[PDB]
Amino acid sequence: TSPVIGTPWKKLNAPVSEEALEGVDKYWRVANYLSIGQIYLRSNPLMKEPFTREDVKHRLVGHWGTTPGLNFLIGHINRFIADHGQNTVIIMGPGHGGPAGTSQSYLDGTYTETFPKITKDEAGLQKFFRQFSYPGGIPSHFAPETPGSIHEGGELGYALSHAYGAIMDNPSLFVPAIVGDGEAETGPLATGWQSNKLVNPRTDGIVLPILHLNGYKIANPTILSRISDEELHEFFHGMGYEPYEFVAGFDDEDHMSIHRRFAELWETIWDEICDIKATAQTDNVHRPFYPMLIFRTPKGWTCPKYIDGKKTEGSWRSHQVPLASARDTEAHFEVLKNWLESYKPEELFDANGAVKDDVLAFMPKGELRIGANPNANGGVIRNDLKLPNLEDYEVKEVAEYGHGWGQLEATRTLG
Amino acid sequence: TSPVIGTPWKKLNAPVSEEALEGVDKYWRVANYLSIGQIYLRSNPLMKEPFTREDVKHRLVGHWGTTPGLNFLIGHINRFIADHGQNTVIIMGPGHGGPAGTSQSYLDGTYTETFPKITKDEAGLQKFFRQFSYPGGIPSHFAPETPGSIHEGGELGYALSHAYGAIMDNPSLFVPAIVGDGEAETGPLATGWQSNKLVNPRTDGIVLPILHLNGYKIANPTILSRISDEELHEFFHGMGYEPYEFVAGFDDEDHMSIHRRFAELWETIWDEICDIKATAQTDNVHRPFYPMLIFRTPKGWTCPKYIDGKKTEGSWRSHQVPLASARDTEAHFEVLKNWLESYKPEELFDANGAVKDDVLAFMPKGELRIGANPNANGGVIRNDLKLPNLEDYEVKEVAEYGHGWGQLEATRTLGAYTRDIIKNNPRDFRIFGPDETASNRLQASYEVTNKQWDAGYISDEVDEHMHVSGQVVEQLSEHQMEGFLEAYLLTGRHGIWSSYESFVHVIDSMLNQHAKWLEATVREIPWRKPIASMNLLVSSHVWRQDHNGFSHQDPGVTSVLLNKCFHNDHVIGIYFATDANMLLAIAEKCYKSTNKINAIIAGKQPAATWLTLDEARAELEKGAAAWDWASTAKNNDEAEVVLAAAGDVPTQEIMAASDKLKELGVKFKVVNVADLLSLQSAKENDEALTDEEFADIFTADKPVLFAYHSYAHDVRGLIYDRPNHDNFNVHGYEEEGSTTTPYDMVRVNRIDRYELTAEALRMIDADKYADKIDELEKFRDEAFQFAVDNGYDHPDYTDWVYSGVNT
Ligand SMILES: Cc1ncc(C[n+]2csc(CCOP(=O)(O)OP(=O)(O)O)c2C)c(N)n1
Ligand SMILES: Cc1ncc(C[n+]2csc(CCOP(=O)(O)OP(=O)(O)O)c2C)c(N)n1
Ligand SMILES: [Ca+2]
């Protein structure tokens, strides 16, 4: 049976600390750097004299558009897991956001603990950037080679079925299920919404759907992003959700002001989930309205606004890589240089090239870590079934009346 | 007259101090510890090593489920009392939560003050735990043995009627009245909510109903916990309450928050109560919406959430004890050990085994303490009534024109008398009656007071003798009337209520509980001073329910009261008013009495007056009497038969039989019984007639014809060991009757003057009188046939006057 890990469904009963939010901005900035690093750089991770086209991958493999959104969410969730001691597994619906997933495991320390060649320093950092979507390295998606992934999100649609399946008989487990807004256009996902009728808040755990309403899929706007907000909210309330919405990155709002609002909303949503779980200990025959979070951010968020006169942040044009090559010209290479410098890595890495102690101090520890949670490695929880004696079920009449006897339904015996 | 105690209806005006709330949490934790202790532990109260199963009681007796809930409330009420100086009596509906009431008394210092053997140290704490629901110890309920209690809550449902009685003519008294959600399903409780239209916020106190909505009774959920919150709110609003609801303990919210929320809420309600009381100084004709509190908390609050995989906290399983045994296994004793440790007694007790000073610093002092408040031992407040001269009510006409005079309605004389009791003892005496005060002829009291009514007035053409304040109260519920009067007596006041006889049975069970309360009090609770008697006029009785019929013909309350006549307790009076004058004598005796349920059977129909006041006083002091002036015999040897009557109508039929016997020249003795218990075996009752006195009245060898108001079984079982008992031929009500004539009522029950005369002849010489007997049986059928044919009674029955009357 599922382990009860940590201290589940605890309210903070305190405002989110400023130090932690500074941590989350640092997570967000490093994770965006490590993410652009994995996509663009074969060598010279930390951009030291000389940083040039020499240090840039020939073929650009990886998806950026979803990634900074996922980095924002996962930074905030990590702050959450540490503060609350909450048994948490994420479902990365936008699996193409693989850099968000590896970056996460590198920073939570489970990548080095699992792949010890990939050290916490400039040499490791160079290896780690190179191996992403690289021959004889690791995948571009959040693949099973990634600690914390029970879900690749290569074939979109199974984000909610996986999330609700995982919480069955798993009363202590919390699942942020990040659904893409393109993904939410698939059949499997469209009915996956309705699974809140087939789970019990007392005996199963809790799914939090996070719609990544980032406005676009590959080459198009998403339906849910371009319907009225009043429709979007009714849709979700019709399917048994309390929809909360968060909009950020469309204006000049400083990043710390965004982190403060997001954290305040997250813990409001969390108070309600804690209320649902407390009630269920008492009344679990009346279905509550489960919070869901509509996360509205520009696609490619924190990438260059415009590149070669085309809108890139807040556009489908950022889905894969906003800058299609950092080698073809030297203007293009200065865009990647400026883009990488914008996160100010001179503040994130020490001399050796280790992520600084102040960037990761807010992060959770041990089995609570997204990458080290046993649920993310089901195998370590799995026991052999106590099977009954197979004789007891055998159609015995074959020995006595011989081969080919009777008009039995074979399934009933399996029943 | 109720005393003004403390500083009543004062707002706080500052928030509740963090210091006082830390107190309350400690009270709560220690009261919970004391409460589990009393249930579970025979020894080693503080768990000093070694603490083992040898310290745990063999049989687990007591209730946990209700108790943590009570402890939280009482903790908070004690804070309230201390800060406000509020005159407060609590009514513990779920009286099976006695551990909370003993804990309260232990911690406020009334327990040690009352039982000095039970000390404020480890050794006292040990006797305290052992004594609870334990041979030679104390009850498992909030029994009269507990300081603070005027309500056991053994028999559920009297919580509100007791709460509302207490505040009547008690303007400073606050009564937080805690009601089981299971209790609330009973009929008596359901009607008790409506009491808010019968009290006045200027002249009466304030009752705050607290519904203890713990979700469960014994083995079931409660109706009020499983209807919508919206329905529950309209329900209380529709009965004239402003409902507030508090919900705590279904989640991880820490104890200090719970206490802060509750204390703010409590102070918001109290503010509203202080505004009701302040407004009532100016305007007491508009009925206010009285606050009530819905206290929704999990049953067994703070016990292990689960025991052996069974949900225990917030279940009916915590009803008695959540942990069935702490001896059978080590794992079980372990659960007990953990549970007891979770209140952290190391913080609450000093090494000497006393509760630390910082636990009880918030507590009230002196007479404001729940346990010490004189309203919870109303004997100490009780004064004698200033009674008018019985002489001024005497029917003088018996002395003038002779025994047997007139067509008076005896209950009218009790009315004139009680009227002047109210006049002379305002704020100290109440008539209750289930829409029957005028019907039983007690309305003379309307000359000096009114019926208290705090619902709508519409017109002087119908709203006669009604005011927002008055000493008479009427609802069509015997429960409410028994209930209000019981609590008005327990808080040190006085009263009478009246009922049609048949319907006294409605509140048989309430007579049982008050009798038990009184039985327990007079045996072993001498600190609890005596209260005025529960005086009950039983009238419109079986022999004259000829107009209402068979449903109204049951005098059996006599039989019920006889089952509380033991051990020389002397808590039951059963009086038969022979006439107006016997009724005054009984009345004065009852109104002077204490620690009794007095039942006065008196007719309201026109009837003869037999005795002067003096003759009645005399017969009453011994309980029975030969009627020399009525007797043709001169002594017991001459007497061929003894004619004995108990009840105003049997007396009438016997006296008339006596005139027919007188003409046949028979020698007979006439006996009247006014006190049923005077016939009780002198072995069982030291106040009964001695066998010598008995034999002197009933003769010892002569046969006795006994005409009895109620069922003959009552007498045949009272006199089983008495001299001459086998010669007693007892006639009583026999479940015969209908809507008919007065004569048919006596006839069909074989207690009419004709049958009595015949019976007397049979018993002297059957063969010698065979023909006068046969003439009498024939006439019995002719008078019936005369009624059937004319629709009134044969003029022989109707026009008869005792021979002893002169023009
Ligand atoms: C069933 C399926 N059809 C098509 C694709 C190809 N594909 C991968 S990403 C993508 C767009 C996804 O958009 P969205 O879910 O909005 O992700 P994000 O905007 O976060 O990149 C598509 C069509 C797929 N992975 N699965
Ligand atoms: C008139 C009456 N009928 C039945 C009972 C038996 N009885 C005693 S306790 C109880 C349940 C009480 O439930 P509730 O008032 O909800 O009490 P709590 O949950 O506070 O223990 C029952 C049925 C009783 N005491 N009185
Ligand atoms: Ca999208």
Ligand SMILES: [Ca+2]
């Ligand atoms: Ca209850």
